[PDB]
Design an enzyme around this catalytic site. Structure first.
Site, mmCIF file in Angstrom:
data_model
loop_
_atom_site.group_PDB
_atom_site.id
_atom_site.type_symbol
_atom_site.label_atom_id
_atom_site.label_comp_id
_atom_site.label_asym_id
_atom_site.label_seq_id
_atom_site.Cartn_x
_atom_site.Cartn_y
_atom_site.Cartn_z
ATOM 1 N N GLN A 65 0.807 -1.205 0.000
ATOM 2 C CA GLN A 65 0.000 0.000 0.000
ATOM 3 C C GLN A 65 0.845 1.261 0.000
ATOM 4 O OE1 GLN A 65 -3.348 0.024 -0.266
ATOM 5 N NE2 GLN A 65 -3.141 -2.188 -0.576
ATOM 6 N N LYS A 106 -1.557 -1.786 -9.397
ATOM 7 C CA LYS A 106 -1.901 -2.351 -10.688
ATOM 8 C C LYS A 106 -1.629 -3.841 -10.694
ATOM 9 C CE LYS A 106 0.520 -2.505 -14.399
ATOM 10 N NZ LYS A 106 0.120 -3.869 -14.868
ATOM 11 N N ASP A 144 10.577 2.944 -11.676
ATOM 12 C CA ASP A 144 10.075 4.206 -11.137
ATOM 13 C C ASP A 144 8.622 4.468 -11.504
ATOM 14 O OD1 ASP A 144 12.316 5.005 -9.671
ATOM 15 O OD2 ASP A 144 13.283 5.860 -11.445
ATOM 16 N N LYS A 185 -2.555 -8.685 -7.827
ATOM 17 C CA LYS A 185 -2.956 -9.715 -8.774
ATOM 18 C C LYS A 185 -4.337 -10.217 -8.416
ATOM 19 C CE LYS A 185 -1.480 -11.971 -11.552
ATOM 20 N NZ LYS A 185 -1.683 -11.942 -13.017
ATOM 21 N N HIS A 213 -2.303 3.665 -28.042
ATOM 22 C CA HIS A 213 -1.777 3.012 -29.219
ATOM 23 C C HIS A 213 -0.416 2.407 -28.909
ATOM 24 C CE1 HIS A 213 -4.711 5.883 -30.896
ATOM 25 N NE2 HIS A 213 -4.894 4.955 -31.817
ATOM 26 N N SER A 241 2.400 -4.012 -28.662
ATOM 27 C CA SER A 241 3.824 -4.165 -28.920
ATOM 28 C C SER A 241 4.674 -3.593 -27.797
ATOM 29 C CB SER A 241 4.199 -3.504 -30.242
ATOM 30 O OG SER A 241 4.074 -2.098 -30.152
ATOM 31 N N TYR A 262 11.472 -6.138 -33.595
ATOM 32 C CA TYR A 262 12.348 -5.016 -33.288
ATOM 33 C C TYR A 262 13.815 -5.419 -33.259
ATOM 34 C CZ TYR A 262 8.157 -2.390 -32.254
ATOM 35 O OH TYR A 262 6.947 -1.744 -32.350
ATOM 36 N N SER A 311 1.092 0.344 -19.414
ATOM 37 C CA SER A 311 -0.099 0.282 -18.587
ATOM 38 C C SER A 311 -0.102 1.360 -17.527
ATOM 39 C CB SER A 311 -0.217 -1.083 -17.929
ATOM 40 O OG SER A 311 -1.398 -1.163 -17.165
ATOM 41 N N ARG A 338 16.797 4.746 -18.348
ATOM 42 C CA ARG A 338 17.127 5.345 -17.060
ATOM 43 C C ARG A 338 17.164 4.307 -15.955
ATOM 44 N NH1 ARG A 338 12.899 9.358 -14.547
ATOM 45 N NH2 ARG A 338 11.960 7.307 -14.142
#
Lengths: 496, 496, 496
Positions: free
Chosen positions: A79, A85, A114, A121, A204, A208, A257, A376, A454
Site C-alpha cells: 500500500q 496495478k 520508477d 494480482k 496506441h 507491442s 524489433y 499500462s 534510465r
C-alpha cells in the site's frame, strides 16, 4: 521444480541482506546504532508479506439455467504507493498461494522502473473455454462489483489489467461495470483499468509494449562495453543471433524489433514444435504463417529442428515460455551467453547460481518484462488526463521544426546565398515520416525507451556499488527493495 | 474430535435436503418443474460458502522499539442483508478455516431470531497476554483502519462486536478510530460497533444478555407441555435442577435468572475444578466467592465433587464450556433430560444422533446462544436512533397508568363509593418498582424475551411441519435456511 | 370526457381562489397589502406546475436477441418536502402529459394526510404482457440505474412505489439494483422503494391498506351526525348498504371491513359483468369465487343483474373503476346518497357540480384513496429505522397491562376480598387476541386509522371556515393548497 512462491520469497531475503548493510548507514536519524538495525531488520519484515488478500464467491447463472459458484482471489501486496496495478488471470490452476507471489513480483517490477503504483494480482478459478461469451461477461461484470464494493478496484485504489486468457474485450466489461455502478460519480471512472481497446481509452502501440520492453532492455546491455567484454561478446547487435522460446505477443514483437537492428532470429520454439534456419527467419513471413496456420509447425522457409530449444547454439535466449522453464536439468546446456527472460520466472533459482559459474549474464524478469507495466502506466495517465498524448503539441512542435530549418537556411543565405542562390534546408526522408506520421504511438514508444534506459543505468550502478558482477537479478531486487524502503522509511511506517 | 468447520458445514446439508422438498412446491414461478429444482438445488449452493474473506498484515511497533507483523482475518458470510455483525477474536489458534465457519454460524444464528443483518467474524493472531495496554490499542486502532478502508467496517456494512479476550474497552478503540478517520462524515459513526461501554452508547443490561438468552430459550421449552411429556419431565421450572459447565458470563447470569424461578443449581464446573451440593448453590454467594478468590475451587458451602460434570445427575445441562465439549466418549453418560448449549457447538454431531436414541431434547446453540446477538442488535439501533430507549415515553406511559387506576377508582366510587368512602386503587408493591425503577434495561430485557419467544414458536412449528421430533437442532437450521432463502429468492439472486 | 390533466389543473384554481382570500390576511409580514396579494397570487403559480420531468430511453435486449428502445418518464412535482413518493406504471397509454397530472395529484393527496414527502410519478411505455419475466427485470433493473444516476431515486430524493401492473416483485428489482450499484454506500439503501415483499422490508397489512383507507375515510363521515342529517341518512353503518364497482384490491378489502360493521354489500361490478343480491353478498365467499374462477361473473348465491352499476339503488357507491368513470351521461341516475371514490378521479368535474344540486356528499379521492400513501409512508420508516414496529415494546407493554389488572385486583381484594375470596381480573376474550396476536400489522392499521381520522377533522373544519357545504372535494384541495403554501412561504421560496 520449486514452488513459484518460494522463488520470489527467496530473492527478497537474498537481496534484503545485501542492501541492509549500507541501508542502515544511510540513516541520519536521532537514535542509537542497534535501533537503526532493528528499524531496517523490521521494515523489511513489512515489505515482504502481502498486506491484503481478498477471496470471493459468485452466484453466476449459466445460460442453460444452472446457477454455480465462482471462486476468485485478489491480493494487494503493498500500500506504500496507490494505486495498485495487477492483471486478472482466468484459469483453474489459480491459487491464493500464487496470487500472493505474483502480487509481490509486481510491487518490485514497477519499482525498478520508477512507476508509482504498487502491486496486485487477481485470479478467477474458471477455465475460459467452458464458458460462452455471454457468460464471460456475467462473470467479469460481477467479479468487479463484488470487488469494487470492497475497495479493490478504482482509479485511486486498484487498476486491473489484462493477462493471458484475459484480452482487450475483458477490460471493457470491467470499465463499463465500474463507470456505471460505483465509479459513476468519479470523473476518472474510465481510469479503473488498463489494456482497454483503443475505442474506449486504450493507448496506441500497447500490444507491442512487452516487445519494445524486451528490446530496449537487452539493448541497454548489448551496448554496454563494460559487460560484453566480461562475457565474451562485442558491443552492439551487429552480427549477433537471438533465439525465441514461446512465440507470441512477447516473442513475436521482440523478433520484429531485434531483427530491425541487424540481429538474426535463428530458432522459434513453441509448445508444439520448433523451427530453425541458421540463415535466419523473417519475422513477418513467420508472423504471417501462424495467421492462417495457427501453428508455425511446418514453416516452409526454415527446416524443422526439434529438441530442447534451450540447447540451441546462439547468443541470446529469450524465453517467453512458461514459468520455471529453464532448470538444472538443462542449465549446463545453454549455448547462449545472454539469457533474456520474457516471462515471469523462467529461471529456477538454481540455474542462476549455475549461470554465474558458466559466466552468463541473465537479464532479470523484473527489468525486461516491465514493458507493458510501463505502458499500462501511460494508459492510466491517458485516461486520467482525458486527452491523447500530443494532440496539443504535435503541430505546435511541427512548426517549431520548420522554423529552425528556415532560420538555419536564411542565416546561411545571408552569408553564402548572397549570390542569388538558395539552400533548400529540408528534413530527411526519415524525419519527414516522423513528422507526417506523428501519433500517440510515437510518444508511448519514446517514454518507454526512456524508462528502460534510465532504469538499466540504475541496475548497473548497484551492480558496482555492491559488486554483484553478472548477478543482475540480485542487483534488480536490491534497487527494488531500496526504493520501496525509502517510501516506508520517510513516511512514518505506522500511522500512529 | 471433528474439525469445527465440517460441523457447521454438516448441519447445512443435513437441513438443506429437508427444506428443499417443500421449498420447491412453494414457488409459484412461471418455469418448469425441473428448473425449480435446479433453482433450489442452486441457491443453496450460494448460501453455503463464505462470500468474502479478507486477510491482513500489520506494521505494529512494540513499545520497546521493535516492529512486528500482525496477521488478521475477517470473513463476511452472507451479503443478503446488510450490515454483517460479528465479533473480533484475539487469539493464536485463529484460522481462516475457522473464521469462515463461525461467520456462517452467525448468518443463521441471527436468522432464527429475525435479526436483519447477516454474519461475519474477525480474528487476530495475537496472544493478548503478551501485549501491554498501549499495544492492544495500536493493534486495535489499526486493525480497523486497515479493515475500514476496504469496506469491512461501517454502520451499513459490518458491525464488529466483543468476544472472549475482546472486552468493552476494545470496542471503544474501534468506535473512536472509525468515528475520527473514515466514518467522520457519517452521522451514524458510533453505530459501527456494539458492546461499547455505557459511556459511549452501550445499552444497559448487555452483560446479562446471553444469560437472559439462555434463560428465555429453555423457558419456552420447559413450559411446553407437548415436549415435557415426550421427554419425561413436567412443565415449568418447579422442583427441577440444572447444572452449569464453564462458570462465567453465560453460566453466571444463567444461574441467577434460573435460580430466581425455583430451579436449583446443583453443580458448577470450570476448567480447574468442580462444585456440588444437591441442596443447591446460591448464585450470589458463589458469584461473590470468585470475586476475591478468582476461582471457585474451594467453595465453603458446597463440597468438592470432581469428575466429568457431563455425568452429573440432573435435569438440565448447560455447557458454557469450549466447543466440541460433549462427545461420544461421554454421550452415553449424560444423566440429564435436557441439554442447553450455552456456547457454540458443544455437542459433536455424533452425540445428537446418540441423544435422539437416548431420548434427549438438545436445545441448539443457534437459538439459545442468540442472546447477545439480539441485544447487539438493540445496541446498533440505540446508536442508530441517537436516543436511549424509552426516554420519550417512560413518563408519558407512567401517567397513562395512574389515570387508568384513577378512572377505575372514580368509576367504582360512583357506584359503590357513593357512601362517602373511597377505594384507594394503587399499583402493587411490584408494579411500583417497575414504575419508579423504569430504565432502558427494562425495555432491552423485554424485546429480548419477545424475540426468543416468537422464535421458539417458529422452531416448534417446523418440528411438526417436517416431523423432526426432539431434533430441534435440525429444526433450527431448517428455519434458518428457509428464511435466508426467501431473501435470495425474491431478490433476483444475481444482479444481472 | 375531459383530459385528466385539465381536471387536476382545474381543482387547483377552483381551490386557489378560495384559500387566497384568507391566506393573505394571515401574513404578518412587513410589506404593503398589494405586495402580499402579489406574493400569494405568485407562490400559487409555483405550486401549480411540475418542477421536474425526466424522459428516458433504454437499450433493452429481448431474450430472442433483438435490441429495442424503451421510452420512460418520471415527473417530480414539488420539491418543498423531500423525498417524493410515486408509483411506477407499466403501460402503453402512458403520456408525459398524464404523468405530470398524477404527480401533482399526489403532492396534495399526501398533504391532506400530513405525510411529509412530496409527489411524483413514473411511467414506462411497455405492455407487460408482451415481456417474459427475464425481460421485465432487464427493464426494471435499468429503468432505475438510468433514473438513479440522475437523482430521481433514493431514500432522500424519490421513493418509487407499486402500481397497477407493477406488483411486489417489481419493487424488489428496484431495491436490489439500487442497494448494489449506487445506494451501496448508503445505509438506508433499502428505503429507496415501498411495497417490497415482506421478506425484504415490506410492512405487514399493506395489501389491505387502501381497503382500510376507503373504510376509515367513510367511517369518519358516516359517523358525522352533522352530515348525515343534511344528506338524509342516519349516523353509523347500521342498516346501510354499499355497492362496489371494480372488484379488486380496493374493492375487495373495502367489502370485508365494511361488511364487518353491519354494512351490506349489495352489488359487485367489474369490467366484465355485474352481481346483485339485495339480501347482500358474503365477501369471503365471493372472494373465494374469483380465486378459482378468475371472474365473479356467474356467482351462485347472487343472481346476475346487468346494467350501469352507477344506477344501483344503494346508500354508498364505491367506484374502484377506471378514471372519469362517473359522468353527466349517468350522473342524474346515481341512486346513492354518498359516493366514495376508491380510484383516482372517477367523477368528472361536471358531476360534482351536478351532485351538489342533487344533494350528494361526494367524498374525494384525495382523502379516501390516501390509504396506501400512508402505509407506504410507514414502510419507508420501517426500512429507515431498521426494525419492525413494536418489536421492542409488544412485551414491555404486555407486562404493563397484566400489572394494571393485578393492581386493580389486589386493590379490590384489600377492600372486598378480605373475606378470603378473590376477583380474577382477566382481559376479555377480545383483548386477549389483541395481546397474544400482537404484530406490526396491528400498529400499521392503528396509525392508519389515526391519520385518516385526524385528517378528516381538518377537512370538516375547512368546510365550515369557507362554507363549502357538501363540496368536500373543494375543501380537501383547500387544505392541501393551504398546507403546501405554509411550506413555501416560511421557507423563503427562492434560494437567493
Amino acid at each position: 521444480d520449486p514452488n513459484f512462491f518460494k522463488m520470489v520469497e527467496g530473492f527478497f531475503d537474498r537481496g534484503a541482506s545485501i542492501v541492509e548493510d549500507k541501508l542502515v548507514e544511510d540513516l541520519k536519524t536521532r537514535e542509537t546504532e542497534e535501533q537503526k538495525r532493528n528499524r531496517v531488520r523490521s521494515i523489511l519484515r513489512i515489505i515482504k508479506p502481502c498486506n491484503h488478500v481478498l477471496s470471493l464467491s459468485f452466484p453466476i447463472r449459466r445460460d442453460d439455467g444452472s446457477w454455480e459458484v465462482i471462486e476468485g482471489y485478489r491480493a494487494q501486496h503493498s500500500q506504500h504507493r496507490t494505486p495498485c496495478k495487477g492483471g486478472i488471470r482466468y484459469s483453474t490452476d489459480v491459487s491464493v498461494d500464487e496470487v500472493k507471489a505474483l502480487a509481490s513480483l509486481m510491487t518490485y517490477k514497477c519499482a525498478v522502473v520508477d512507476v508509482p503504483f504498487g502491486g496486485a494480482k487477481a485470479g478467477v478459478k474458471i477455465n475460459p473455454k467452458n464458458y460462452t461469451d455471454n457468460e464471460l461477461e456475467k462473470i467479469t461484470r460481477r467479479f468487479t462489483m463484488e470487488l469494487a464494493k470492497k475497495g479493490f478496484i478504482g482509479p485511486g485504489v486498484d487498476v486491473p489489467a489484462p493477462d493471458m486468457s484475459t484480452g482487450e474485450r475483458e477490460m471493457s466489461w470491467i470499465a463499463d461495470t465500474y463507470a456505471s455502478t460505483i465509479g459513476h460519480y468519479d470523473i476518472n471512472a474510465h481510469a479503473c483499468v488498463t489494456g482497454k481497446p483503443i475505442s474506449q481509452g486504450g493507448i496506441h502501440g500497447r500490444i507491442s509494449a512487452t516487445g519494445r520492453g524486451v528490446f530496449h532492455g537487452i539493448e541497454n546491455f548489448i551496448n554496454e562495453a563494460s559487460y560484453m567484454s566480461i562475457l565474451g561478446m562485442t558491443p552492439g547487435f551487429g552480427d549477433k543471433t537471438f533465439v525465441v522460446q514461446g512465440f507470441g505477443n512477447v516473442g513475436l514483437h521482440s523478433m520484429r524489433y531485434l531483427h530491425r537492428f541487424g540481429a538474426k532470429c535463428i530458432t522459434v520454439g513453441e509448445s508444439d514444435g520448433s523451427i530453425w534456419n541458421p540463415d535466419g527467419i523473417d519475422p513477418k513471413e513467420l508472423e504471417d504463417f501462424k495467421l492462417q496456420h495457427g501453428t508455425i509447425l511446418g514453416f516452409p522457409k526454415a527446416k524443422i529442428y526439434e529438441g530442447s530449444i534451450l540447447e540451441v547454439d546462439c547468443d541470446i535466449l529469450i524465453p517467453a515460455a512458461s514459468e520455471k522453464q529453464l532448470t538444472k536439468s538443462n542449465a549446463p546446456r545453454v549455448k547462449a551467453k545472454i539469457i533474456a527472460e520474457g516471462a515471469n520466472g523462467p529461471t529456477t533459482p538454481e540455474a542462476d547460481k549455475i549461470f554465474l559459474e558458466r559466466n552468463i549474464m541473465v537479464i532479470p524478469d523484473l527489468y525486461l518484462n516491465a514493458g507493458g507495466v510501463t505502458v499500462s502506466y501511460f494508459e492510466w495517465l491517458n485516461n486520467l488526463n482525458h486527452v491523447s498524448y500530443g494532440r496539443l503539441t504535435f503541430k505546435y512542435e511541427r512548426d517549431s521544426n520548420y522554423h529552425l530549418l528556415m532560420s538555419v537556411q536564411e542565416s546561411l543565405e545571408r552569408k553564402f546565398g548572397k549570390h542569388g542562390g538558395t539552400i533548400p534546408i529540408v528534413p530527411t526522408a526519415e524525419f519527414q515520416d516522423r513528422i507526417s506520421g506523428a501519433s500517440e504511438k510515437d510518444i508511448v514508444h519514446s517514454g518507454l525507451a526512456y524508462t528502460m534506459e534510465r532504469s538499466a543505468r540504475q541496475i548497473m550502478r548497484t551492480a558496482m556499488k555492491y559488486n554483484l558482477g553478472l548477478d543482475l537479478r540480485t542487483a534488480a531486487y536490491v534497487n527494488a527493495i531500496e526504493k520501496v524502503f525509502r517510501v516506508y522509511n520517510e513516511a512514518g511506517v505506522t500511522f500512529t
